[PDB]
Every structure is written in structure tokens, then in C-alpha cells.
Amino acid sequence: VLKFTTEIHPSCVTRQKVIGAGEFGEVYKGMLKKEVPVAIKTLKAGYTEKQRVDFLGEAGIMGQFSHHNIIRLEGVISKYKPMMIITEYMENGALDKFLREKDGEFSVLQLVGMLRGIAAGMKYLANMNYVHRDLAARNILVNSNLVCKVSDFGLSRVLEDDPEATYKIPIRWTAPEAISYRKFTSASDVWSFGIVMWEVMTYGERPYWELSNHEVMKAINDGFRLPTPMDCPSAIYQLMMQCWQQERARRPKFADIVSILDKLIRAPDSLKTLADFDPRVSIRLP
Numbered sequence: 001v002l003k004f005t006t007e008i009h010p011s012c013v014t015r016q017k018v019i020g021a022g023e024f025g026e027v028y029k030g031m032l033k034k035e036v037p038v039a040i041k042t043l044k045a046g047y048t049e050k051q052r053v054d055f056l057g058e059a060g061i062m063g064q065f066s067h068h069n070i071i072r073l074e075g076v077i078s079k080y081k082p083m084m085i086i087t088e089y090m091e092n093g094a095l096d097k098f099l100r101e102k103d104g105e106f107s108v109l110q111l112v113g114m115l116r117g118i119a120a121g122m123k124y125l126a127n128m129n130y131v132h133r134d135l136a137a138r139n140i141l142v143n144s145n146l147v148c149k150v151s152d153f154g155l156s157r158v159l160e161d162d163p164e165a166t167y168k169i170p171i172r173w174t175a176p177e178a179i180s181y182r183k184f185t186s187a188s189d190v191w192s193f194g195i196v197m198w199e200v201m202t203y204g205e206r207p208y209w210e211l212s213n214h215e216v217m218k219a220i221n222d223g224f225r226l227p228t229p230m231d232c233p234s235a236i237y238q239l240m241m242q243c244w245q246q247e248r249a250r251r252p253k254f255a256d257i258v259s260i261l262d263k264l265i266r267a268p269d270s271l272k273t274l275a276d277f278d279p280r281v282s283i284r285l286p
């Protein structure tokens with residue numbers, strides 16, 4: 001896969017600021033030689049064979065894709081150490097943190113547009129035979145045009161690197177069959193997409209609040225589902241609910257999701273009809 005990747009010389013790359021970090025490398029904002037901003041992920045000397053395969057495997061996978069809603073690879077530094085993966089720079093960072101910092105600042109149409117973009121990237125990945133396994137707002141990046149792009153690619157590194165994945169998966173974003181018998185498919189990614197819809201429409205509320213992982217699994221198995229967000233179009237809540245069908249075959253495909261979201265956006269008055277919100281509090285005044 002790496003034959004598809006541009007090998008970039010280190011003198012073309014300036015790291016400027018740390019924006020992410022782990023035990024074996026960091027992510028930087030930087031510039032790439034007409035200079036352009038880029039994100040730069042490093043792998044420090046001493047890495048194992050498995051770490052090298054996982055790290056360059058992420059770039060190898062990303063280099064196979066060309067889609068507006070999938071993070072673009074610019075190239076790699078593999079002939080010098082530390083090794084680096086260089087991608088486009090998404091100026092607004094991770095979607096979950098972005099929404100929590102911008103609570104209430106977007107229109108419903110803007111939020112639905114973000115979901116359409118995520119769904120288009122996921123339809124592309126699914127049709128390219130790539131199962132994400134860790135779809136969540138924390139793994140979507142947002143640029144200065146409000147474009148949302150799917151990130152976090154690889155094999156075993158995806159669930160290994162995510163702190164939300166517990167002994168190892170991120171339970172409350174994961175479909176039942178993936179938890180119960182390890183069946184990860186594009187239809188389990190659709191379940192996750194339903195969770196991401198709820199994260200977007202709530203401005204980054206944590207799914208299921210303080211329920212424990214066991215309590216979430218028991219609730220889902222008993223037929224409970226997340227309640228409607230505040231100010232959520234009825235069509236959007238119906239769509240996320242259908243993503244959470246227990247029976248995999250009843251879930252929409254991403255092709256259906258993209259189609260529905262595009263129709264709603266193109267007739268935006270459809271989004272003015274809101275699902276009823278069940279208040280958890282009662283305020284009464286004489």
C-alpha cells in the first residue's frame with residue numbers, strides 16, 4: 001500500500017505545535033513544502049515491528065482512499081527517523097470536543113449537513129470494503145468549512161489505541177452483535193453512526209450518561225434506546241432509531257442514510273417538525 005504514498009523529505013516539514021500525544025509519538029500542527037498547514041504524527045525510535053506495521057499501515061489504508069469526507073494523506077517520512085505521517089490539517093479538531101465547546105452555536109441544518117458528510121464518508125468506506133469499528137464523534141475531524149471527515153484508520157491499532165475501548169471495544173458506541181460475538185461489519189458501523197447522530201444533535205452529550213457498560217448492554221438488550229435530543233427534527237430521530245435495530249438486516253445501509261439526509265437538506269422545511277422532548281424536570285409557576 002505504501003507504493004501509493006509520497007515520501008516527503010524532512011526539510012519540507014516543520015512541526016510547530018503539539019496537538020495530540022501518546023507514549024510512542026505525538027501529533028503536531030505544522031507546515032509542508034507554497035507552504036500549507038498539515039498535521040504530522042510521529043513514531044519514536046525504539047518502536048517494535050508491530051508498531052511499525054500498525055503505524056505505516058494507517059497511512060497505507062488512508063492512501064487507498066480519495067473522498068471529500070475522508071482525511072487526506074499527503075505523504076510519509078519513512079526513510080528518516082522519527083517516522084512521520086502527514087495529512088491535511090483540520091482546523092477545528094475532533095468533532096466531540098468541538099461540539100461541547102460550541103454548544104448551541106449551529107443551526108439544525110448545519111448539524112444535519114455535518115451528519116450527511118459523515119454518512120457519505122462512511123458509505124465510501126463501506127463500499128470500499130473497510131469496516132471502521134470505532135466510529136464515534138471523537139474520531140471525526142472538522143475543518144474551517146465545517147466539513148466532517150472520518151479519521152482513525154488501521155487494523156488492531158484502532159481499538160487498541162482508543163481509551164474508550166475497554167476489555168477491547170468502546171461498548172456504548174458498538175452494535176450488539178459486535179459486542180456479543182465479535183461480528184464487526186458495515187452494519188455495526190451503522191449502529192455507531194446512529195450514536196454519532198445523537199452525539200451531534202446533543203452537542204456532544206455522552207451516550208447513556210453515567211450508566212455503566214454493563215447497564216448499557218442490559219438496557220439495549222431489554223429494548224431501551226437513547227431518548228430524543230432537545231430540538232431534534234423528527235425525521236432525524238426516526239433515522240437514528242432505525243440505526244439501532246437489534247436485527248442487523250433491518251438497519252438502513254449507509255446508501256439509505258445518505259439518501260435520506262440529502263433529501264431532508266434539500267427540502268429543509270422538513271427539519272422544522274421536531275420530535276417531542278421528554279423533560280426530565282418540572283418547572284411550574286403560578
Ligand SMILES: Cc1cccc(Cl)c1NC(=O)c1cnc(Nc2cccc(C(=O)N3CC[C@H](C(=O)O)C3)c2)s1
Nearest residue numbers: 019029039040041071085087089090091092093094151
Ligand atoms: C487522521 C490522521 C491519521 C494519521 C496521521 C495524521 Cl497526522 C492524521 N491527522 C490528524 O490527526 C489530524 C488532522 N487534523 C487535526 N486537527 C486537529 C486535531 C486536534 C485539535 C485541533 C485543533 O483544533 N487545535 C486548535 C488549537 C490548536 C491549533 O490551533 O492547532 C489545535 C486540530 S488532527
